[PDB]
Structure formats: structure tokens, C-alpha cells
Design a protein around this nucleic acid. Structure first.
Lengths: 115, 115
DNA sequence: ATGTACCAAATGTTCAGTC
DNA sequence: GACTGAACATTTGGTACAT
């Protein structure tokens, strides 16, 4: 990298890991939660980057899919994620702290020099 | 836009606007002047970004490219930038405060949520 | 650290497809 | 109508160069 701010694909993946930790969820719920958690700041992610994020985590080996059923009254079927390789969730979580830390210095530094 | 972080280009341009205000934006080696500034944190732009950022403010009509005497000289000439459009520069700079404030909130939040 | 010119990467829009 | 998915294309950044 040239080491500028963290990229959205990364920021979202990290949030996926944090959320899997607390409750095994599926794509559109993850978005519901992120969207509303962030609706004051004005970050409005969309369902497909969230999905591409989860998807990458599968290639990374950090997550696995489990196909289960939902209770919308629709007898549908939903896809939850669960840790495959826990060590790699940790390692990914570590890399992003670094990235987010540099990112904090940059914005603060930028807010200082220019304002 | 979804409203994620500030864009790299918008971020360099902001510095250039400020450096112009401080009469610190002169010479061709703006890259090294900007690299030197961010070497601590670990941000290291390449020439083509600095070129692209610098050359947008000219084309957009915010900056003008001039020739003056190397501050204190008799003959030697260096390149200087001044405000062609100081209105469009102040407005823009305001836009960036918001853009940075919003960005701060996101990173403080990501760190607070995930760590 | 010019200025180009062609490359790769990040990600929004629209649609495919199933309940 | 709630859900998972992916091509396409843009807006962008990066590499490479001779200069």
C-alpha cells in the first residue's frame, strides 16, 4: 500500500468478525445493524459490499457458511456465518487495528495542519 | 456516495490549498515536501497522485502557476502557486472540515466497537 | 517529480435468481 | 416482499518510462 486510510472492504470485514463473535448472523441482518449503528455519522453501506466482504472472509478461511431456516413466516432459508479458522480472525483483527490507528493519526493530523 | 472516509485526492488537495495560504507551496518537489510531512504515520503518496491532485486545482481554476525569484535572490527563478479562485478554495476547504469530522467519528467508532 | 499512457483495484448500480 | 448473489462499468489509483 501507499498507506492511506483503511478501505471500505476491510472496514466492513472487520465488523463482520466482531459481529460473528457476538451472534451468528446472515447478510441482510448485518447490514440492518451496520446501517442503523452508522446512520448518524452518515455511512450508508449497501448489501453487495457487505456480501463481497463476507465472501472474501470465506476465501481468507476466517468464515464458513451455514444454511439454515428463517422465521419471516415464509419458510425461506438463510445463510449464517461461523468461524472456521479462529487464529486468522485474530490475525486479521490485529492488522486492522494498526490500519485504523494510522487512519486516526492521519485525520487528526490533517484536522490540525489545515484548520 | 455511501459516505465512507475522505478520498486520497480530496485529502492532498486540502493540504495544497492550506500550503498556498501559507505561501509554502512552491517548487516542483511537492511530492517530497508532502512525503516528508506524513513519513511518521506511514502515509507515502506516489508522484502521479500528487501530480493528479495538484493539476486538478489548476484545471479547476483554484490555483495559478507563476514564476518568481527564489525568495531572496537576484536572478534565480522558482515556481510559485497562488489563488486564482480564493472563493472556490475557501468553500472547498469548509467542505473538507465536514468530510474530516465525519471521518474521525467513523474511526473513533470502529476502534471503540472492535477493540 | 514531468506527463504520459496504459494497468490494476475499490466499489456503486442493476439485474439474476430464489423464497 | 425478504434474501443471496455477481456482471458490469466507473471512478480511481498505480506502474513504467524516457526525460
Amino acid at each position: 500500500s501507499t498507506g492511506f486510510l483503511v478501505k471500505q472492504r476491510a472496514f466492513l470485514k472487520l465488523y463482520m468478525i466482531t459481529m460473528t463473535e457476538q451472534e451468528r448472523l446472515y447478510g441482510l441482518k448485518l447490514l440492518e445493524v451496520l446501517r442503523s449503528e452508522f446512520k448518524e455519522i452518515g455511512f450508508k453501506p449497501n448489501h453487495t459490499e457487505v456480501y463481497r466482504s463476507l465472501h472474501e472472509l470465506l476465501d481468507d478461511g476466517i468464515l464458513k457458511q451455514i444454511k439454515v431456516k428463517k422465521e419471516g413466516a415464509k419458510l425461506q432459508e438463510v445463510v449464517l456465518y461461523q468461524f472456521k479458522d479462529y487464529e486468522a480472525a485474530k490475525l486479521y483483527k490485529k492488522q486492522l487495528k494498526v490500519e485504523l490507528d494510522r487512519s486516526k493519526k492521519l485525520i487528526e493530523k490533517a484536522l490540525s495542519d489545515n484548520f
